[PDB]
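Methods: holo model generation. Sequences were used as deposited, without trimming of termini or removal of tags, and paired with ligand SMILES retrieved from the corresponding compound records. Each pair was processed once, and we did not select among multiple samples. The sequence and A1IP3 SMILES for this entry were:
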Amino acid sequence: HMESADLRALAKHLYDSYIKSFPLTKAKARAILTGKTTDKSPFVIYDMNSLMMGEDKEVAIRIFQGCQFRSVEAVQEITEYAKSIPGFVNLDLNDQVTLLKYGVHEIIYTMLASLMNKDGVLISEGQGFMTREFLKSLRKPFGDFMEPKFEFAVKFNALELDDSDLAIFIAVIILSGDRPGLLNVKPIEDIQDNLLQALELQLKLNHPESSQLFAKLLQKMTDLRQIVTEHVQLLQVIKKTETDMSLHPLLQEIYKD
Amino acid sequence: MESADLRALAKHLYDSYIKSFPLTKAKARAILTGKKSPFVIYDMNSLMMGEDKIKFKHITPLQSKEVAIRIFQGCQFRSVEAVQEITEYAKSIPGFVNLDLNDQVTLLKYGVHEIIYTMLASLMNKDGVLISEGQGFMTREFLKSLRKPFGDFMEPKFEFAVKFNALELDDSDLAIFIAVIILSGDRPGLLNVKPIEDIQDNLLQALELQLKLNHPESSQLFAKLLQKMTDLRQIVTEHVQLLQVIKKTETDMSLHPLLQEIYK
Ligand SMILES: O=C(O)c1ccc(-c2nn(C(=O)c3ccccc3Cl)c3ccc(Cl)cc23)c(OCc2ccccc2)c1
Ligand SMILES: O=C(O)c1ccc(-c2nn(C(=O)c3ccccc3Cl)c3ccc(Cl)cc23)c(OCc2ccccc2)c1
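and the model returned the structure below.
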């Protein structure tokens, strides 16, 4: 258990670290998506020609490779954020690897929702915007690989969470005591209890009209687990189909077992 | 919603849960701890004797003679029997019968799998499972040891149960939790999501308060119980994949066609 002023201090600590670790914030992403600004307007990629012009090997692959490159970048930013979570770096080292192995993907989809609306996703630190249409229309398995992310984002974004909320929620995901192969579950759950308490109080003060948002947000962790599972199975199909294509070692290790 | 209203809802659901389900968790734990001794099925010979002596309804011979198949089919028979108990309990949830009839059917169709896994945990410990309203006890080792895919079909249930039971929920907790599962607004094909999520919001409030008063020492048990809905969705998805593999591999399975229709 934790006292109220301590929970507020924990939320601010985590928000502060989240700002320092993730360069493209939800607040910034929404300002770019909403427009009414002449200085932050993205170039829109909606077909092959605008893709060619936007840049100033096969297209579905190039886009896929672009996604993997950005995901590796996200794993780095998420890893840096995790170190800031009080108690994380004090855990057994093998458990640190384990929590990150199973948590980074759930966080990537979570934070990817910040870059999405129902019509597309921001890319290249907000400078570009690729339409859901164009991604959904990619050939072979790649088209169907993009759309389920949009489906989750539309539902997740309906919760209207801001960055200060997401900062604690991401922490809760990482500090999951039910990951396979964890050696010392007890110290992980003690931290998650602190984070969960901090999330609860945070949501109450920041969304007081939004009844049971706490519970509704935790139920979204179920959606996350599903899409991470869907993702892995699609990668295996691409691995057996496109054998000229290579994954980053960091990603390679993450998906082993 | 006021605190006294939440307790009234909780008590309402508990009373109905007692009436709808034959073997409560409270009773099951009395049998499992040894506190009227159940017949124990731990191998082939004891199975033969129990079905001759006790005569368990879901594991009487009926087309197939192979044991592992009969046990597998017996689990499905009991699951279909459970669906009716859950359906009757759902009728008691305030607001449920007022929902669109198609929506009632949709909530039950996609929810029963999660509820069965949940309530099966009440009947399990790390060593086995109660059957036939507590009269029998089938050991985990005997179930795990069934041949080809059948043994591996049984074990994941125990693995979930053991983890779930560590929350030490009681029937009054479970009655509200089961209600929350039923009123899931994200089921495919729902026509009117709003009144479903409004009811679930009431139930979640009632569940939260129940857990605070029933388990004040158990910090964030609410959140931890909500995290188990992930495990449920996961194992239910796995369950489907295992049935499909058994369906394409096992042709010793055919039952009387009317039986196939009932237990589809
Ligand atoms: O900025 C960001 O935080 C961030 C995080 C993620 C993804 C992403 N990964 N991604 C993947 O397949 C993937 C995810 C996790 C691990 C490995 C992979 Cl391989 C996507 C599939 C579809 C979509 Cl719509 C997005 C992604 C991301 O895509 C931006 C992008 C889209 C199109 C072309 C180039 C880049 C951005
Ligand atoms: O009484 C009870 O509430 C109740 C609820 C459940 C199951 C059950 N379903 N079951 C299933 O495949 C199943 C089918 C659909 C949905 C969920 C499930 Cl989980 C089992 C698999 C293994 C085991 Cl060990 C038990 C079950 C149950 O099994 C009693 C039983 C055990 C052995 C042989 C015959 C019957 C009892």
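The two ends of chain A are 35 Å apart (CA to CA).
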